[PDB]
Symmetry: D2
Subunit: 445 residues, 4 copies
């Protein structure tokens, strides 16, 4: 009644209880109702949240994700659970098992990718394992032995097939690959997707999630599905995709994450005596994509811009993706101070109506802002976690601590919502979201 | 390495993670390997540990236990899980489904009982539910509606069938019913059990638990099983059991718990407008068994004694059961001060070699003390929990806090062992014990 | 900014910082400017707050107060700091140094008393000292050797001089002695106090606290000061006050505190082998004042009433003092359930407009309620602490816990105010009150 | 008894209690009896410890130190408390009031300096103040207005007067200025200090700390005091010290601190709009001293070496000062990995006999190691704090965390010692050291 918040220990217990409840055996669902399968970057966050509970089970999560890796290195964004339906588009719609020569054997997966946060999860598992003694270190190190080459092939497929022109930015062929499906970032690119006649479909996500204010519209999923048809018509061939996709964007946030991931993976490889050629490639990619992120930035504010490859125009929007350069580094001193000022000022974390000092997914003063609508305004604990972890790595200890502290306060209701209304703090969307429990577990220490 | 202990939040998360991992769906195993079924007083502790995580699931645990209640009110001490084997004596050995007219339908259970801590679990669920708002209160109150009469019938069967002469003490027909199977308390009663030819058996608990120093011997399980044959030969008939059992003891610790349970259940019934006749009976039983506990006590020390009904002699041993009167109250002032002095002095919590200020199951200076052997010396977190909760209820706030604090320190290794070596703090016995996680969760708040 | 409150460690640090900043050397001021001297029941709370910081300095605080005890055993309610002004009425107005034959020789004091919480402070000092090792235990035990006789003389003075008819209630000759100067409890008794020729004066208290809504009015002060003239005219002679005092009330809250204090001090004397005749006297007084409190109570609700000795009339008001019987026990079971229901319902802690689940000094629905006016409504952390500590001693562990939780949450702003607006939570009166810091330190542990 | 340590809240409270008890009013003593005056780098730590208690009082502590700054910008290492004795050498021995033209007019000080951690204290004060609201921010900002020029003059004095050749390292004329009086770093430099006619004296430091194994020897003090005679003979003239001083060493640890401090103060001047020419100077010095530190380093391990200016020889010793480059950055990637390996391995933090995972002041395997002797081996919480804070600024969040965790665990005894025996954990030297309390308060948050 008077205080619906949970104590830190009650909150940690409930978060761990949620993670174990979402565990199907070898994979954790992204969320029981809305997302009853394994999602790629949710799984990396899940592995971080499991690392304080069981290094063995955190490793199993990544082991299961990488068993679904495509022949060519791509980590698909969904690994479908054995016979679980409920979700759409499902494996039948994707048809990767019969169409894609690179699809894995005895996993059903999607045909698209998602951001490479996995090296970060590996670092956190390693750091936990080193606090727990010899046998737990053995587990983490045996994992590195098993999966280092798979991780390299993941990073190499991004660097060679989604940055074909060595521009230092990752090209996406669907907004789902950004992790921020309905972000204002992609409105103008989706606006140029004109679909033909697409096979008949019954939407599945809105049956469970009632409120249309906290879900995407019906015109969105028509184009969302047309892109799937385009990929199918070329059997998900990497060499043919540029010739046919009606959606081709360089995602600057995805690219900054990849830069950071490369640097983290490189330092792991140094510490664990991995092949020198692998470490050298990872440092080369880290620097290339740092450079590719900085090339997009506004000269006065430092704001990073996405790039629409088909239209050949910078996508200028006011979302949290503008702060990509803060994650990977590389901006000139003055331009970075300018970007921190934007982050902390009234267009983002300093907006006077915000309940928490946290980063809204879209600026409240932007014309595209919708306080309830996924990535068009709400605050996402997973973004708070990622910014706070990257800020700590830049040496911004106090900024990272402020994000953690406000993130823990917002999460203390124990809804483990995927996102929160930025003004009222109302939990929104799916409750029971695995990666919000994971963020809380990693924060609480 | 330097500090193998977990922080309070890490420990709470791991405890909740263990409880959810031990959940079969509607019941929680007492321990994954050694005890893969539902045990009666473990389940009550499990429900307490679940109450901070999910009032709904805490209620389900007790709902599942009471669906196995016998026609006559007895709560059996094991509810066997659907088809899980591994344990012995199993349902085949017990044969209650075909022999006992009172056995439940579509549960497999044992034919013996275990201490009535369930009202305490109900209180803790109620107290949690009242902090969580209207819908969670509705769940707890709907449970009371469903199960109040079952709880009354539980208490009434103890009061009328295991205290047939209204002496205010519970008679047991097997040491397993005490919850402290191999306690020195029962050595002289087991010594008078001479068995015939008992059906051939292969012990199951020692296959998983290697060390014979932390398990009971082979002569113990021969008599343990002979008693089972005696109960079978009279189809578990309550009226016939006194005529035939070779083991009949009044358990003073069990009786003190029942007294406390009656008082707790009575106060619940007052608060939730249960029938007046039920509340009045519960207060009558609380006072009868308080009186029955006090009648056993040594006039100088207050130590409570068990009673061997067949031998007609007070069982004088130096175990933690001597402190039964401290739980239920009723001793004269001076005699209670004397008993607290014994509890805190060098024969128990004040012994100079103890690692924690906690109650050893048997006094280290006793001839029967074995530092590694179950209830013959080790410290059990479940006993710490129960003494600390009962002490708080007597108003001994500081004593209760000291027990909690030392219990949390001992448990901070995260083994969730059932018992610990009293001198070195080594975790012993089964790890992953549900009710040790439960105690930690309730303590941490 | 986004959350003004402090973490538990920051709060504990700031409480300790305040307590040391108010330390004049051997005494601690009740508040820096408003109350720049030693108050008697504040000093007990101060000693409780110092015990986790320094047992040696906690003992010093009580040594200093007891060095000011009158020759007849009275502990006076103010011990003035040498050569400190800024509080009225000061030493010159009281004129005890010149008029009172029983006043101390090396100290300047007031000529009235205050509630006997001192034994509770001695119990907290002893409980802290027992956890800290041998040299610290010796410090606490030497304090007992040195001051047990003084504590007995304090309790004996109250029992014989302020309960001359052995009614088991404490008579007060000034509302200041209740600790609740402007409580509605005293309104009708004050209306019968007619000041005669009262020598001129200027308040100093409302030059520091200038908001007129937070302190008593001029008219109330004229009566407060006139009572001093009546005492001074008989030179503070115990034997003459009944014949001359225009204010004579039996204070049931003070009486319940005394009952508890006697029982606490008796238990200490048993533990530390004090003379048996003293322990016997203390247990006798504990019971006598318990019965005297219960004798006052409403037959339906259990509410305790003060008694106007001059008017020979029960004083019926709706203040926190009604709950006196919950502190000391003694009510029939049914009427204590009713009384608890009154405490927890809409007239007190369950009032729907309260910011915290705490006890307002006057019921929000009483005609006498004033949300800002001292003891006429505001929430006082000192009352919270006493209720929570005494509840825990009754065995009401969850009730005590909830009051402690809500008190920490209210106190988390770090103002250390003496009282708070019950609806908005605004801190009122003087900031930096030592006994609020002390409550916070004891709660946080 | 069973666990001597304190909870985080009890520890925080006791740290704050100590800091306020050492407060003389406008300055805080370094330790009650041993160091009963204001030491310069202790005072910076004191200001860090006060910032979560009172921004106003933290600012006062730095105001008091800066009011004692010399006319040429030097911050002297002792500001003597008015009319306080018990420390030698006191104001009369130093004779700065009479001999030093640059000494302050309203203050008595020493005639040597100490490391410039002051800018780090200003950053912590500002970070605290930004979380506390408008009036508190104004207090911190007014401090900046009032003292920025003084801080610049401090940094400028070091950069121009103690690095006259622009080598980017700070020359010291007394081992006391390093903060590490008896470090093995200075042994060979001290062996070349020959006292002439040295006026008689009695130590006061080893009358308080009487165990001869914890303080420097008589022979060391004769050299310490003779250096004072050489300074006094040239009236503390910066321009003459190079010609007369028998002790002239470049201190690489002091130099790294200065590099960090310059960078911190530059960042503050940018945030708070200080003159651009000042920010430019600070960034220039930051880089110059970073390069001067790196120039000293071992080509294989990265270890930094001090330089004996008179002997023109690198000083190779195995102390914590070797790790100077980790504070300020600048090493090539490979050699910093080597240096981190040295810090974490068996020669320092990974030595198998260490009670805590902390940095001993001298390596346990060095011939110079002495487990009790001041800076020749003991673990100093001040070093832990500086390393952990600077590590976090490098982005090594887990390394910084581990040092903070081990430092809290060592400090949890509440002794607030300045240094600890590396193997047993025994607190050494003076208890009640303010800057250990300050580190604990900052760590606990
Ligand atoms: O891809 C989709 O169909 C839906 O995507 C949403 O759910 C995923 C699982 O939680 C997240 O991985 C995404 O970030 C989020 O936007
Ligand atoms: O009954 C048995 O066969 C074995 O009994 C042991 O295991 C049970 C499950 O943990 C506990 O309920 C008992 O207290 C404990 O003694
Ligand atoms: O006695 C007075 O003159 C003023 O009294 C107030 O201040 C005292 C010091 O905090 C408290 O002890 C009282 O309870 C409170 O009513
Ligand atoms: O300078 C001195 O005479 C004595 O020096 C010691 O005491 C100081 C105060 O704590 C510290 O600042 C030094 O680091 C430490 O070495």
């Amino acid at each position: 009644p008077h205080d619906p918040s949970f104590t830190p220990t009650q909150l940690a217990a409930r978060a761990a209880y949620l993670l174990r409840g979402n565990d199907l055996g070898t994979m954790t669902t992204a969320a029981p109702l809305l997302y009853p399968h394994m999602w790629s970057w949710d799984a990396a966050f899940v592995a971080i949240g499991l690392a304080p509970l069981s290094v063995e089970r955190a490793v199993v999560e990544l082991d299961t994700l990488l068993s679904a890796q495509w022949r060519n290195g791509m980590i698909p964004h969904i690994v479908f659970a054995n016979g679980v339906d409920g979700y759409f588009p499902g494996p039948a719609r994707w048809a990767t098992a019969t169409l894609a020569d690179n699809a894995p054997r005895n996993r059903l997966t999607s045909g698209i990718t998602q951001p490479p946060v996995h090296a970060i999860a590996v670092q956190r598992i390693l750091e936990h394992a080193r606090t727990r003694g010899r046998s737990t270190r053995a587990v983490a190190e045996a994992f590195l032995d098993r999966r280092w080459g798979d991780l390299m092939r993941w990073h190499r497929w991004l660097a060679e097939c989604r940055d074909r022109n060595e521009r230092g930015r990752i090209t996406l062929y669907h907004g789902w690959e950004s992790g921020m499906d309905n972000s204002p970032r992609w409105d103008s690119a989706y606006a140029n997707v004109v679909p033909g006649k697409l096979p008949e479909y019954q939407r599945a996500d809105n049956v469970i999630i009632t409120d249309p204010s906290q879900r995407p519209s019906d015109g969105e999923y028509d184009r969302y599905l047309w892109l799937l048809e385009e990929m199918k018509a070329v059997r998900y061939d990497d060499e043919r995709l540029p010739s046919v996709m009606s959606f081709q964007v360089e995602d600057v946030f995805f690219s900054a994450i990849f830069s950071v991931a490369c640097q983290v993976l490189a330092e792991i490889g140094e510490d664990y005596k991995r092949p020198h050629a692998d470490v050298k490639d990872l440092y080369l990619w880290a620097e290339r994509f740092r450079a590719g992120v900085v090339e997009t930035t506004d000269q006065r504010t430092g704001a990073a811009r996405d790039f629409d490859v088909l239209a050949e125009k910078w996508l200028v929007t006011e979302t949290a993706a503008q702060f990509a350069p803060l994650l990977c580094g590389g901006l000139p001193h003055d331009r970075e101070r300018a970007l921190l000022k934007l982050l902390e000022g009234p267009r983002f974390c300093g907006h006077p109506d915000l309940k928490y000092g946290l980063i809204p997914s879209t600026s409240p003063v932007s014309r595209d802002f919708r306080p309830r609508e996924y990535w068009r305004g709400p605050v996402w604990p997973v973004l708070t976690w990622l910014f706070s972890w990257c800020f700590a790595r830049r040496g911004w200890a106090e900024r990272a601590r402020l994000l953690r502290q406000e993130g823990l306060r917002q999460a203390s209701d124990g809804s483990f919502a995927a996102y929160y209304e930025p003004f009222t703090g109302e939990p929104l969307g799916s409750m029971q979201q695995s990666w919000t429990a994971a963020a809380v577990l990693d924060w609480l220490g």
